[PDB]
Design a protein around this motif. Structure first.
Motif, PDB file in Angstrom:
ATOM      1  N   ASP A   1       0.777  -1.240   0.000  1.00 56.46           N
ATOM      2  CA  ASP A   1       0.000   0.000   0.000  1.00 56.46           C
ATOM      3  C   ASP A   1       0.812   1.295   0.000  1.00 56.46           C
ATOM      4  O   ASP A   1       1.354   1.716   1.026  1.00 56.46           O
ATOM      5  CB  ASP A   1      -1.012   0.008   1.165  1.00 56.46           C
ATOM      6  N   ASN A   2       0.874   1.926  -1.169  1.00 58.53           N
ATOM      7  CA  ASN A   2       1.598   3.186  -1.351  1.00 58.53           C
ATOM      8  C   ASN A   2       3.116   3.048  -1.323  1.00 58.53           C
ATOM      9  O   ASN A   2       3.836   3.939  -1.785  1.00 58.53           O
ATOM     10  CB  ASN A   2       1.172   4.217  -0.296  1.00 58.53           C
ATOM     11  N   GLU A   3       3.608   1.938  -0.786  1.00 58.27           N
ATOM     12  CA  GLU A   3       5.043   1.733  -0.710  1.00 58.27           C
ATOM     13  C   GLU A   3       5.532   0.519  -1.481  1.00 58.27           C
ATOM     14  O   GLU A   3       4.880  -0.522  -1.498  1.00 58.27           O
ATOM     15  CB  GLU A   3       5.469   1.620   0.749  1.00 58.27           C
ATOM     16  N   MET A   4       6.679   0.668  -2.133  1.00 57.19           N
ATOM     17  CA  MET A   4       7.276  -0.430  -2.871  1.00 57.19           C
ATOM     18  C   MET A   4       8.493  -0.891  -2.072  1.00 57.19           C
ATOM     19  O   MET A   4       9.336  -0.077  -1.691  1.00 57.19           O
ATOM     20  CB  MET A   4       7.701   0.027  -4.266  1.00 57.19           C
ATOM     21  N   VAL A   5       8.576  -2.188  -1.798  1.00 58.13           N
ATOM     22  CA  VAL A   5       9.695  -2.720  -1.030  1.00 58.13           C
ATOM     23  C   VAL A   5      10.576  -3.610  -1.884  1.00 58.13           C
ATOM     24  O   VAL A   5      10.094  -4.533  -2.528  1.00 58.13           O
ATOM     25  CB  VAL A   5       9.211  -3.534   0.179  1.00 58.13           C
ATOM     26  N   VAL A   6      11.873  -3.329  -1.885  1.00 55.62           N
ATOM     27  CA  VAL A   6      12.813  -4.115  -2.668  1.00 55.62           C
ATOM     28  C   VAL A   6      13.868  -4.752  -1.771  1.00 55.62           C
ATOM     29  O   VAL A   6      14.533  -4.069  -1.001  1.00 55.62           O
ATOM     30  CB  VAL A   6      13.515  -3.240  -3.710  1.00 55.62           C
ATOM     31  N   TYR A   7      13.997  -6.070  -1.851  1.00 57.98           N
ATOM     32  CA  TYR A   7      14.999  -6.776  -1.067  1.00 57.98           C
ATOM     33  C   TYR A   7      16.187  -7.038  -1.981  1.00 57.98           C
ATOM     34  O   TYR A   7      16.050  -7.653  -3.039  1.00 57.98           O
ATOM     35  CB  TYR A   7      14.441  -8.086  -0.527  1.00 57.98           C
ATOM     36  N   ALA A   8      17.350  -6.533  -1.579  1.00 56.69           N
ATOM     37  CA  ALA A   8      18.564  -6.683  -2.370  1.00 56.69           C
ATOM     38  C   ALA A   8      19.651  -7.395  -1.588  1.00 56.69           C
ATOM     39  O   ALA A   8      19.953  -7.032  -0.454  1.00 56.69           O
ATOM     40  CB  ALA A   8      19.063  -5.309  -2.835  1.00 56.69           C
ATOM     41  N   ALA A   9      20.225  -8.418  -2.210  1.00 48.62           N
ATOM     42  CA  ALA A   9      21.286  -9.202  -1.606  1.00 48.62           C
ATOM     43  C   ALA A   9      22.624  -8.545  -1.927  1.00 48.62           C
ATOM     44  O   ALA A   9      22.751  -7.842  -2.926  1.00 48.62           O
ATOM     45  CB  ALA A   9      21.253 -10.635  -2.152  1.00 48.62           C
ATOM     46  N   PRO A  10      23.629  -8.750  -1.064  1.00 52.27           N
ATOM     47  CA  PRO A  10      24.969  -8.187  -1.248  1.00 52.27           C
ATOM     48  C   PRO A  10      25.846  -9.075  -2.136  1.00 52.27           C
ATOM     49  O   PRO A  10      27.023  -8.790  -2.356  1.00 52.27           O
ATOM     50  CB  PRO A  10      25.486  -8.067   0.181  1.00 52.27           C
ATOM     51  N   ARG A  11      25.256 -10.151  -2.643  1.00 51.99           N
ATOM     52  CA  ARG A  11      25.946 -11.082  -3.528  1.00 51.99           C
ATOM     53  C   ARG A  11      24.922 -11.929  -4.282  1.00 51.99           C
ATOM     54  O   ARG A  11      23.747 -11.984  -3.900  1.00 51.99           O
ATOM     55  CB  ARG A  11      26.876 -11.997  -2.734  1.00 51.99           C
ATOM     56  N   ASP A  12      25.374 -12.581  -5.351  1.00 51.83           N
ATOM     57  CA  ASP A  12      24.523 -13.434  -6.182  1.00 51.83           C
ATOM     58  C   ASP A  12      23.712 -14.376  -5.297  1.00 51.83           C
ATOM     59  O   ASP A  12      24.270 -15.111  -4.478  1.00 51.83           O
ATOM     60  CB  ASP A  12      25.389 -14.243  -7.153  1.00 51.83           C
ATOM     61  N   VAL A  13      22.395 -14.360  -5.463  1.00 48.60           N
ATOM     62  CA  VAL A  13      21.554 -15.207  -4.641  1.00 48.60           C
ATOM     63  C   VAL A  13      20.475 -15.946  -5.447  1.00 48.60           C
ATOM     64  O   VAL A  13      19.495 -16.435  -4.887  1.00 48.60           O
ATOM     65  CB  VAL A  13      20.912 -14.360  -3.519  1.00 48.60           C
ATOM     66  N   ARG A  14      20.683 -16.047  -6.756  1.00 46.62           N
ATOM     67  CA  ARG A  14      19.735 -16.710  -7.650  1.00 46.62           C
ATOM     68  C   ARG A  14      19.405 -18.170  -7.302  1.00 46.62           C
ATOM     69  O   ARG A  14      18.250 -18.591  -7.412  1.00 46.62           O
ATOM     70  CB  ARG A  14      20.238 -16.614  -9.099  1.00 46.62           C
ATOM     71  N   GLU A  15      20.410 -18.939  -6.892  1.00 46.42           N
ATOM     72  CA  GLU A  15      20.197 -20.337  -6.524  1.00 46.42           C
ATOM     73  C   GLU A  15      19.603 -20.426  -5.112  1.00 46.42           C
ATOM     74  O   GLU A  15      20.016 -19.682  -4.222  1.00 46.42           O
ATOM     75  CB  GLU A  15      21.523 -21.097  -6.578  1.00 46.42           C
ATOM     76  N   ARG A  16      18.634 -21.321  -4.910  1.00 42.28           N
ATOM     77  CA  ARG A  16      18.008 -21.478  -3.593  1.00 42.28           C
ATOM     78  C   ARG A  16      19.087 -21.736  -2.549  1.00 42.28           C
ATOM     79  O   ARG A  16      19.056 -21.164  -1.461  1.00 42.28           O
ATOM     80  CB  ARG A  16      16.981 -22.618  -3.602  1.00 42.28           C
ATOM     81  N   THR A  17      20.038 -22.606  -2.869  1.00 42.42           N
ATOM     82  CA  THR A  17      21.135 -22.848  -1.945  1.00 42.42           C
ATOM     83  C   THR A  17      21.855 -21.503  -1.938  1.00 42.42           C
ATOM     84  O   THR A  17      21.683 -20.712  -2.866  1.00 42.42           O
ATOM     85  CB  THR A  17      22.084 -23.954  -2.463  1.00 42.42           C
ATOM     86  N   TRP A  18      22.645 -21.223  -0.910  1.00 44.03           N
ATOM     87  CA  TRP A  18      23.348 -19.939  -0.844  1.00 44.03           C
ATOM     88  C   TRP A  18      22.377 -18.760  -0.637  1.00 44.03           C
ATOM     89  O   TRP A  18      22.774 -17.597  -0.680  1.00 44.03           O
ATOM     90  CB  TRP A  18      24.192 -19.713  -2.115  1.00 44.03           C
TER      91      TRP A  18
END
Lengths: 757, 756, 193
Positions: B29-46
């Motif tokens: 609601d009215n706000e957009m939240v973005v979660y950003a990793a400090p390193r590659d995190v595409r794979e579920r592991t890691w």
């Protein structure tokens, strides 16, 4: 560094004493000595239990006044000192009166006020241009780090701007900036610099050199808003106020004082070319690239070999990679068989992996720590050691390898690195590590420059140096550095080149630095500089060809301007303020510049081609578009990739060559002169130079009424004179007339013509 | 704060982490939240054993995009916090595709790139105005001092200059400077500032407010040459990109967001006069000093009492010194009987000698150290203590003392200090000492300002404040501090005033010892041709001449003052703000615009030489009436009763018929002045009422050589001077007469037409 | 992961050093023929547990400190879990157990790993709708087929969890002396306890 804490306090832990009152003025031959007390010492019972400052005034050159402020003299004061040219017989006058103590050299004097109200003033013909107000200089006793410093603060006037301090990439005008003169390898997008120079200039016609090779901390309008503060860890502070009503006159004196820029060989002003880093797989790939340049009619005059001409991890042991270049001299001679000149990469460090490393370690040619072990770290190269250039035997060994390279046919060297010189070390000659840090850039480049001067001749010596220090301008063509592929970085680059010029360096090279449009814009900028190197579509080729040809044609002009740098220290790439000191609108211009005395260049920093630039008073003409614009104002234009603002000043007589394929050729043969807006009662002079920079021919065009009297003196044949924007005249006495796109082309017969408009 | 060490290294001891890859985008609601990793995190592991940045985008209002980037949310995060006006129902759109995540408010939006190449861009209708490149923002774990910081670096484009950051006295354009927003008492000639504001503006039409009351360390093109870097000791970083195609528009959104400058009373625009710090020895040394003023026909409107109205070493116990002012009330009435408004010096500290100190200590109204003892030092006042304005009863006590002064006849206060707020303390309400340092300036002036509002009325409230913090522009007239007596100092002062305007403050006053007469004289012109002026034998002529001019300019000046209140457009404007499109105006700092149509260039030399730039157009000198064409610089010489004051073309200026005071009926006898009206142009002029609302509009529209003058509202006995027009060959519904400035027309109503 | 300040010897006795804080043992490592134990404390308490044989020592020790409970027989079966982070959905774990059904590999207990919850939010007991839309449905289907199920859990909670703010407001997470939350980026971002 921060000394004060606002106007009412001192930074915690600092104890300060200042020259507050004159005690005695003495004259020692050619110098004046002033002894000042940090407190009142008029009563004899007070003439004890107090420190005392010793200010010595002397003059090393006419118009240069040196000031040495001393606290303790018992300090070691070792290490290297700047290579200044100090004269002993400079004519000066010393007046010790009831109220003042004045020392004068030329039109510049240093005056100290006696009695109450201490003051140190620098006067030009009796007018104050700057100075130190009471309590603005002195000794700083730092009890936090147990270190001591000396400082001074020279006043800045209303609207007075500061320039220089080396090749920096921050805003052109230094006011508001903190600057540490300490060589560092931090790229070209930060406050750090590869070439630091404790010298600054202002738009008020004077310069200042803080004579200290160790780090000098400048607060330019950053602590005391209208003052240029400088401090140094030392028991004495010495600086030189350099006069020259004009900025140009300052550079003249400054370079005469610390070193004149050498005149690079005409062939060096051509297009240098290096292949994308790490792609020099072998002679074939190199020839395939050079042939590619010729197949597309792209002039190439110098080829550079990158780091990989040597084996990886053992950089600069001077051993060619066998697996890459089996036959070094064979390949070089083949390349030089073609007009091509050769340059190879080198630096003052050496990786541990090199077979030669152990040898040098045994002989002791590498920089050591106080305990005798080698100084090493893993930056740049593994187990990287440093060549100790304070050791004659190491210098000899290094130089010999260079001669070995010259003997093979290499013409010049790209002296890379040289900034990261450690201080936790012990030099062979026992130099002060704090001073050696910067000066090392000087000795390293001086060594390499002397090798060329002893093998190919001083007139042929050229270099591509990334690091510098005071006096290093004597070993010509300093390279700008890295640079990313975007417009802001391109603009940063220019500020750096402009700044080095304002620092006594007459020549500056950089790489044509990734959107195709950025590359193409950078091309124009690249070729419209004293020296340019092409690093690594089809229109891109048109752009490189266009400006490369353009530069080759401008050589008669360019080269004469280059001689000016060697003779007067006037850099070829000039900040607008330097060329028009009295114009308020030029104070901050940093996106355009004068390329020589009469050409205004304004690179475009947009893909669409939009550009804005200012033109000082007068009517300017585009070099080849021939359109005219009035001065004293800003302009907005849109340029294609084969264009950019390149305007020629009025009352100008330009010299263009008939060769657009190479920089080095007979400029006085078949030369085409161009006259630009010669005003009634004005004379436009032009001097074409000889390959050695001397004036071989002089053409003059004076106007009286509506009659133009062009007279030539010297050696030149089959030349022409084009009256720009003049479709036809009604009086050509002693010469032939013709028509062209740019105007009426007059073919004379004897260096003496007269044309009535 | 230096974070990187050149382009290849990081300062020793610092561990950095940045938002490198978008992991998830959630709308709330009215706000957009973005979660950003400090390193590659595409794979579920890691997708564990790694820090994670939470970026929240919101809009406190139209055209303003807020960005909050956080590491740990478990920190205390105590107040105070800036007094922001946060609208909850702003119209915003969140667009979350698989390539970009974009939050938008008005024409401004924040866009985050997904995938391999991280990017944070701010767009104006799709075009990038600035942004943060990968690894140019993040968390700094400083192992040297065991402190943690958050930082961001917003791009700067080619030729992009930065302005603002409070009332600073360094070079006007901030590029190349380091700036710490931390209030200090450092004078007016250093890098320090009494009024720090973590807000900056650029010539690209946008602004940025870093929402942190504690120290914000800015590296404006001083670390990363082409970026504005800012860091703060916090587990999160929040800043606001403020759109405003033009600088004025930026300031409009910014003042609406943090506070509108209030409208000061007209009488405050008159000449203020103070007692020399070492002179007000008696009720007579002054009661007679202002007569010398009258005798020489020198209009004086406000009289200010310095620190000495109280006993030495007891500064600000609010007690009148009995040996100096036996009858304070009686003395104030005499002064007011001479047509003077009264202002007195005050500050938020109190010396231990004061008989009241003991009382405040026992009641616990003074700032205390953590152990409960009193925080004291010997700077300024012996055993000086600070009133804890975080303690309700202390505020009331202080306020009641102020109400006592108003009851006596005092009209306004010079809120003098408030900068040196210690941090090794414990505020009554448990505020974070680090955030309280700056905010104290706000709390302090808000207290005093509200007392005036409650006693004399909001429209009569005025101050002379030395200190400030975000939002304090709401408490009008900030004083520039004490300057040394030279030209370079005069220049520094101007940069300060121009900078404070570029920082959200609409009004600015400054003072005009042992100064050479010429410097003093040049400064007078500068002083009166400013928002508010305080003074402190040819010099008499200069002061008189310029005070009279200012009084005549009030109909125009006051309307401009209402602009500040309505749109936040400061009165003293940097050339860059008035002409954003002009390249020649980026660094202009020795001249300014006084309101919409007047260019003022103070002269900084004895000989009278001065150089200024004039934007495109044909300008007319306010009273010399000479003309100059713009788009270039000019050089001139002026005597002490002159300086460059140029009127823009196509402008209709209202001047009054009273040169003895600033507060009079402007719409009566008003003399209008038309300056170079071009064909196809219309010039409007709004004369205001005492409350700042427009009470009469006059309009001159030209078609061919016909100028149609039409007016609406109340105004009478007004005239219209056609600057530089010797005579016309057609005048309908009006009389005419010659004049020095040009032909003057008298209307027969308020709808006459003239034919050139 | 499991430390117990208790030891036994081949001489038929045991010793329990009664201190929950760190006990430092030097077992014939300082004094070669002695078991040395030290602890930061103003007193030291330990118990010598007899029982001629090792079994009698454990009998007394477990009586003293706690008897192991008797687990249900089904737990003695063959527990199964998938490769970490491979539980992409309900269909994926079924085809997996069905792969077990064939090949005739008895499967008694199935285990759900960390990813039954949202990443970085680990242990907010919140099923991940994208992976397991119908939790109760899937569980009943797995059971009602002979399978007993186990689920992964821990005593920490990542900051990303929507319930984190709640636990923080209610004061349910481990705090520092100054009242703020204790956190670090190991295992989970802004992890709390």
């Amino acid at each position: 560094m921060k000394i004060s804490d606002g106007n009412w306090l001192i930074q915690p832990g600092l104890n300060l004493i200042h020259p507050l009152q004159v005690f005695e003025v003495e004259q020692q031959d050619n110098e004046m000595v002033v002894y000042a007390a940090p407190r009142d010492v008029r009563e004899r019972t007070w003439q004890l239990d107090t420190p005392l400052f010793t200010l010595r005034f002397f003059s090393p050159q006419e118009g240069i006044v040196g000031v040495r402020i001393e606290h303790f003299q018992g300090a070691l004061n070792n290490g290297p000192h700047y290579p200044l040219n100090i004269l002993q017989d400079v004519k000066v006058t010393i007046e010790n009166t009831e109220r003042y103590a004045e020392f004068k050299s030329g039109n510049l004097s240093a005056r100290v006020s006696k009695g109450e109200f201490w003051s140190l003033d620098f006067l030009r013909n009796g007018e104050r241009i700057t100075g130190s107000q009471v309590k603005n200089n002195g000794y700083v006793q730092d009890t936090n780090n147990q270190r001591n410093y000396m400082f001074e603060r020279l006043d800045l006037g209303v609207g007075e701007t500061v320039y220089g301090l080396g090749e920096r990439f921050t805003a052109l005008v230094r006011n508001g900036q903190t600057v540490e003169t300490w060589n560092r390898d931090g790229g070209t997008s930060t406050e750090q610099a590869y070439k630091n120079i404790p010298f600054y200039m202002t738009n008020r016609g004077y310069g200042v050199l803080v004579n200290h090779p160790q780090c000098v901390s400048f607060e330019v309008g950053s602590e005391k808003v209208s003052k240029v503060q400088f401090s140094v860890e030392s028991e004495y502070l010495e600086y030189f106020v350099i006069d020259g009503p004009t900025p140009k006159a300052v550079l003249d004196r400054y370079t005469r004082f610390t070193g004149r820029p050498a005149l690079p060989p005409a062939w060096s002003f051509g297009l240098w070319l290096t292949t994308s880093f790490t792609t020099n797989y072998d002679e074939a790939t190199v020839n395939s690239f050079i042939d590619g340049m010729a197949e597309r009619n792209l002039p190439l005059h110098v080829f550079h070999f990158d780091c990989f001409w040597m084996k990886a991890f053992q950089w600069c042991d001077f051993e060619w990679d066998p697996l890459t270049f089996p036959d070094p001299e064979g390949m070089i001679r083949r390349l030089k068989a073609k007009g091509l000149k050769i340059c190879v990469w080198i630096n003052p460090y050496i990786g541990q992996k090199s077979p030669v490393f152990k040898e040098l370690q045994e002989k002791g040619y590498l920089l050591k720590r106080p305990d005798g072990s080698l100084w090493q770290w893993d930056k740049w190269q593994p187990g990287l050691a440093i060549y100790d250039f304070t050791n004659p035997d190491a210098c000899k060994w290094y130089a010999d390898k260079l001669k070995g390279l010259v003997a093979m046919g290499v013409d010049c060297f790209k002296t890379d690195f040289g900034e990261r010189i450690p201080t936790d070390v012990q030099w062979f000659d026992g130099s002060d590590p704090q001073k050696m840090h910067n000066h090392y850039a000087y000795i390293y480049n001086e060594l390499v420059w002397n090798v060329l001067k002893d093998t190919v001749g001083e007139e042929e010596a050229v270099l591509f140096a990334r690091s510098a220090s005071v006096g290093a301008q004597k070993f010509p063509v300093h390279w700008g550095g890295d640079c990313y592929a975007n417009y802001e970085s391109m603009a940063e680059s220019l500020r750096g080149g402009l700044s080095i010029g304002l620092s006594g360096f007459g020549f500056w090279s950089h790489d044509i630095g990734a959107p195709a449009h950025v590359y193409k814009r950078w091309c124009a900028f690249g070729l419209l500089s004293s020296h340019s190197r092409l690093h690594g579509d089809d229109e891109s080729c048109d752009v490189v060809r266009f400006f490369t040809q353009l530069k080759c044609r401008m050589m008669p002009y360019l080269y004469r301007e280059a001689a000016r740098a060697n003779a007067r220290g006037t850099p070829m790439m000039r900040a607008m303020m330097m060329e028009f000191p009295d114009d308020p609108a030029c104070d901050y211009l940093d996106r355009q510049y004068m390329l020589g005395d009469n050409v205004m260049v304004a690179p475009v920093f947009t893909e669409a081609g939009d550009v804005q630039f200012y033109l000082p008073e007068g009517r300017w003409t585009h070099l080849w578009h021939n359109d005219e614009l009035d001065g004293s104002r800003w302009h907005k234009q849109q340029h294609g990739f084969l264009s950019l603002p390149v305007y020629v000043r009025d009352n100008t007589l330009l010299a263009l060559g008939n060769n657009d394929q190479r920089p080095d050729y007979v400029w006085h043969e078949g030369t085409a002169f161009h006259l630009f807006n010669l005003q009634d009662g004005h004379e436009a002079v032009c001097e074409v130079p000889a390959a050695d920079g001397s004036v071989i021919f002089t053409l003059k065009a004076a106007r009286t009424g509506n009659t133009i009297t062009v007279t030539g003196a010297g050696e030149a044949k089959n030349w022409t004179l084009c009256l720009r924007n003049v479709v036809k005249v009604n009086g050509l006495q002693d010469g032939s007339q013709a028509e062209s796109e740019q105007g009426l082309v007059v073919k004379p017969q004897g260096n003496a013509l007269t044309i009535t408009l």
